[PDB]
Design a protein around this ligand. Sequence first.
Ligand SMILES: CC(=O)N[C@@H]1[C@@H](O)[C@@H](O)[C@@H](CO)O[C@H]1O
Ligand SMILES: CC(=O)N[C@@H]1[C@@H](O)[C@@H](O)[C@@H](CO)O[C@H]1O
Ligand SMILES: [Ca+2]
Ligand SMILES: [Ca+2]
Lengths: 138, 138
Amino acid sequence: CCSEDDCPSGWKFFGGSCYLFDEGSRGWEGSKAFCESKDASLVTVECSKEDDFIRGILSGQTAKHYYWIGARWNEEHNDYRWIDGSPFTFIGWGPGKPDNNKGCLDYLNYKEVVWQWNDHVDCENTNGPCICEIDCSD
Amino acid sequence: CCSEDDCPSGWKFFGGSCYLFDEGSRGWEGSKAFCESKDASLVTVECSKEDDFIRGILSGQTAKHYYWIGARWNEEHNDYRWIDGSPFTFIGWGPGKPDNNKGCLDYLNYKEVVWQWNDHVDCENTNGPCICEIDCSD
Ligand SMILES: CC(=O)N[C@@H]1[C@@H](O)[C@@H](O)[C@@H](CO)O[C@H]1O
Ligand SMILES: CC(=O)N[C@@H]1[C@@H](O)[C@@H](O)[C@@H](CO)O[C@H]1O
Ligand SMILES: [Ca+2]
Ligand SMILES: [Ca+2]
């Protein structure tokens, strides 16, 4: 429900959402907490246009090769899904993914995974940047 | 997931969605079918900014005093909710609404209901304009 003018300074507008591409260095759980500290949440990716919007941003730098996003293995439902509890619609796994290690998802840029989703086994101690999202739904 | 440039000609952009404010004259069921004919669906209103975007458009004319939207009494769940099966989040009923007549929802402009939701008892034979939505989720 966001418009351009709704995005906080340093956030980017796409597709009714505002996004923060945060260059800090945290674990997945740390990253979830960080986005919450901004009245926001790790990004959820509902469609291929949003997937490609994200890829366009991550592809414009080369320093970092993964960014945490808002999905992880879900014990209750026994699947990977968004942290808001909603199942995947768009499917964005890279070649050969998921490994099914009951881990946490990132966009990964490694070998044949070209800014596509990977499940990483370590939700705690693997430090990287992250992507937060708001949709101004109020 | 829509951007401005994604909206078909005659549709309007707001908040990641494209909207058709169609001035044809159909019943609610007719209106649901019409939006489907456009690879689209009667509008669902997830937030107060989208509610007010819609109000801004409907308020700019005076000929019509109601427009069909994508919600109706749901037999299974025994409530009013969106036709996509999802429950209300934003609550947009006008003063004194719902009547609880197990009907179909419109934006209504009548007496103290000032372009806010009403439940109309007749889902079939009450002819009016409607609001279709796409979110380009592909
Ligand atoms: C943080 C991240 O995604 N790391 C991935 C890892 O999970 C593994 O999939 C590997 C190939 O064995 O590529 C990595 O560098
Ligand atoms: C189409 C529509 O919403 N019509 C509403 C009707 O449902 C009723 O609520 C009435 C007041 O009794 O206002 C009407 O004209
Ligand atoms: Ca999203
Ligand atoms: Ca909507």
